[PDB]
């Protein structure tokens, strides 16, 4: 076989994703992800931001419009941590970090997990 043709010229694009990924749950509804500040050599050009993809785990939609809600988070500029607000308590979540530059994204780093504690607020039933 082959599978080939198409070429390009230009297109600087990123190459690797951030080191030492971790996440710390902060509040019942708020977590804080951590990652390493990648080299410009991997960014190739001008770092726009970190994006984070994440989804609800341990809910599992089932039957009625069965899919997984795969949400996105936006941290422009060269942070090394970024919060997950507007989540749920007593739930598992999965997320991953991706670099973005002036040309596009590159790869996403290894996925991570966090479970949120229990709750807080005027719950009753």
UniProtKB/Swiss-Prot annotation:
Changing residue 71 to T: In NEDNMS; uncertain significance. Detected in all the examined tissues. In the brain it was detected in the amygdala, caudate nucleus, corpus callosum, hippocampus, hypothalamus, substantia nigra, subthalamic nucleus and thalamus. It is found in: Cell membrane; Cell projection, Axon; Secreted. Residues 17-119 form the Fibronectin type-III domain. Glycans are attached at residue 27. Belongs to the immunoglobulin superfamily. L1/neurofascin/NgCAM family. It is linked to Neurodevelopmental disorder with neuromuscular and skeletal abnormalities: An autosomal recessive disorder characterized by developmental delay apparent from infancy or early childhood, intellectual disability, hypotonia, peripheral neuropathy, and/or spasticity. Disease severity is highly variable. Most affected individuals have skeletal defects and dysmorphic facial features. Some may have ocular or auditory problems, behavioral abnormalities, and non-specific findings on brain imaging. Cell adhesion protein that is required for normal responses to cell-cell contacts in brain and in the peripheral nervous system. Plays a role in neurite outgrowth in response to contactin binding. Plays a role in mediating cell-cell contacts between Schwann cells and axons. Plays a role in the formation and maintenance of the nodes of Ranvier on myelinated axons. Nodes of Ranvier contain clustered sodium channels that are crucial for the saltatory propagation of action potentials along myelinated axons. During development, nodes of Ranvier are formed by the fusion of two heminodes. Constituent of a NFASC/NRCAM/ankyrin-G complex. Detected in a complex with CNTN1 and PTPRB. Interacts with GLDN/gliomedin. Interacts with MYOC. This is Neuronal cell adhesion molecule. It comes from Homo sapiens.
